[PDB]
Design a protein around this ligand. Structure first.
Ligand code: HEM
Ligand SMILES: O=C1O[C@H]([C@@H](O)CO)C(O)=C1O
Length: 438
């Protein structure tokens, strides 16, 4: 039985707030920081139990807190957490992920960052008040080195990312607590997500129980460029018949992601959007690629969702490589003038957050072994190629996007630019005060 009151809520449940701020900080004075932490944590750090409660019993903003390796070292927290990538930080790992290092920016270009406060709220006012509360509480014991702020997109684009696609449909469900499981949803032991729980094979200090590792990525997205590419390479026809250019461009976007913008998965809706399906969590995840293991008519081998969660491409259920996501878009809407020009003029993108007990099995496996790997999924009749959305191998060639000409390859410009990121550990709530602040 998972102690829901002791697990930081963004890990297990997700804040699911309209606004989110990530306050990256360095510790100036370890003793004063720890003193502030002992009063801050009981008052502000939001558990999974709070997130599943009625909204009437919830605070106006949620706060979670993670530390980098250098943050833990700065606080005299010296026990090895057992993860291969966490100690060196993400900048040292960025080339491995395929990143263009020249696009990284301060303060992520090293290991100056000691931790991150994540604040979630449904409006800017409350977000700001809780941010100010951190500043007031911790004072000179920290220096804020960056704040990145995100917001859900407006109106009927709420829950969609900046390319236009509904994000946050498919998540693993962990055993150990009472929750609803949707058709097609993976069920995994809790240690896939929570350090020290069943399914976690890493060597953890006892105090690390019920923590998790966050892979944070700051992505800038090139939306007019993405849109222009889909129009220039619009699929002329599918099984159902000929497509207008607009239809063929929409279809090409859906082929690249593995879902239509509505969230309808192409494995279920292979020729036309089904928005009602996309909006129905009882149906929108109920597929496993078993109907398309050895052909690409229903779904390309290299589509985003298929690369990051291969389902039956692995031969059956596999616990090991699932991870939780709690990403949020950032930046202004793309104007009609920007879309017309085909050129990005404003900074917008995704503040990407993925949780797993073993970084190398979650985010990093999905990125390197799968998305970046032209020959994954394995044993296919046509080379899958590089995942078009976040795959980082050049040339960025992906096959099978045209269901009626599956040997045709598409060389896709990179529309998602990594600007920085870090690996954090989020301890349990008790660990924050009994270990970190001790
Ligand atoms: C700006 C960059 C990204 C965008 C715009 C994006 C967008 C999306 C969208 C629209 C979905 C479909 C909704 C869903 O199934 O929940 C999705 C699913 C998913 N993405 Fe991403 N994504 C991005 C980066 C990444 C990265 C870097 C990874 C990991 C390396 C990743 C891993 C996943 C996973 C695991 C799923 C769920 C797959 C499933 O269970 O079927 N995404 N993403
Ligand atoms: O996410 C997945 O869903 C199926 C199965 O677990 C559903 O029960 C599978 O093999 C996955 O990797």
């Amino acid at each position: 039985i998972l102690p829901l009151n002791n697990i930081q809520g963004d890990i297990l449940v997700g804040m699911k707030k309209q606004k989110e701020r990530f306050v990256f900080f360095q510790v100036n004075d370890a003793t004063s920081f720890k003193t502030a932490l002992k009063t801050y944590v009981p008052e502000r750090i939001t558990s999974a139990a709070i997130l599943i409660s009625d909204p009437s019993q919830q605070p106006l903003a949620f706060v979670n807190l993670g530390f980098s390796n250098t943050g833990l070292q700065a606080l005299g927290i010296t026990d090895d957490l057992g993860d291969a990538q966490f100690p060196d930080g993400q900048f040292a790992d960025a080339a491995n992920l395929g990143d263009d290092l020249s696009q990284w920016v301060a303060p992520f270009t090293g290991t100056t960052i000691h931790g991150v406060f994540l604040i979630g709220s449904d409006q800017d006012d409350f977000l700001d008040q809780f941010t100010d509360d951190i500043s007031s509480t911790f004072g000179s014991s920290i220096t804020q080195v960056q704040a990145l702020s995100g917001s859900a997109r407006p109106g009927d684009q709420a829950g969609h990312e900046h390319f236009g696609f509904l994000d946050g449909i498919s998540q693993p469900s962990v055993t150990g607590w009472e929750t609803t499981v949707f058709p097609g949803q993976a069920v995994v032991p809790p240690g896939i997500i929570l350090t020290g729980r069943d399914g976690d094979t890493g060597t953890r200090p006892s105090w690390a129980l019920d923590g998790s590792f966050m892979a944070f990525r700051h992505f800038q997205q090139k939306v007019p460029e993405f849109n222009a590419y889909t129009l220039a390479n619009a699929i002329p026809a599918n099984s159902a018949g000929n497509l207008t250019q607009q239809e063929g461009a929409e279809f090409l976007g859906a082929r690249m992601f593995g879902r239509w913008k509505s969230g309808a998965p192409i494995d279920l809706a292979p020729t036309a959007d089904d928005p009602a399906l996309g909006a129905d969590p009882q149906r929108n995840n109920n597929f496993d690629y078993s109907d398309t293991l050895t052909d690409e008519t229903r779904c390309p081998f290299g589509a985003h969702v298929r690369k990051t969660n291969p389902r039956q491409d692995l031969g059956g259920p596999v616990d090991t490589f699932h991870a939780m996501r709690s990403s949020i878009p950032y930046g202004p809407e793309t104007s009609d003038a920007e879309l017309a020009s085909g050129v990005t003029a404003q900074d917008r993108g995704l503040l990407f957050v993925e949780y797993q007990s073993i970084i190398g099995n979650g985010f990093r496996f999905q990125q390197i072994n799968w998305a970046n790997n032209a020959n994954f999924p394995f044993s296919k009749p046509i080379t899958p190629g590089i995942e078009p959305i976040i795959g980082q191998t050049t040339p960025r060639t992906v096959g099978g996007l045209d269901p009626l000409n599956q040997n045709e390859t598409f060389t896709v410009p990179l529309f998602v630019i990594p600007k920085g990121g870090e690996y954090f550990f989020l301890p349990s709530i008790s660990a924050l005060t009994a270990t970190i602040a001790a």
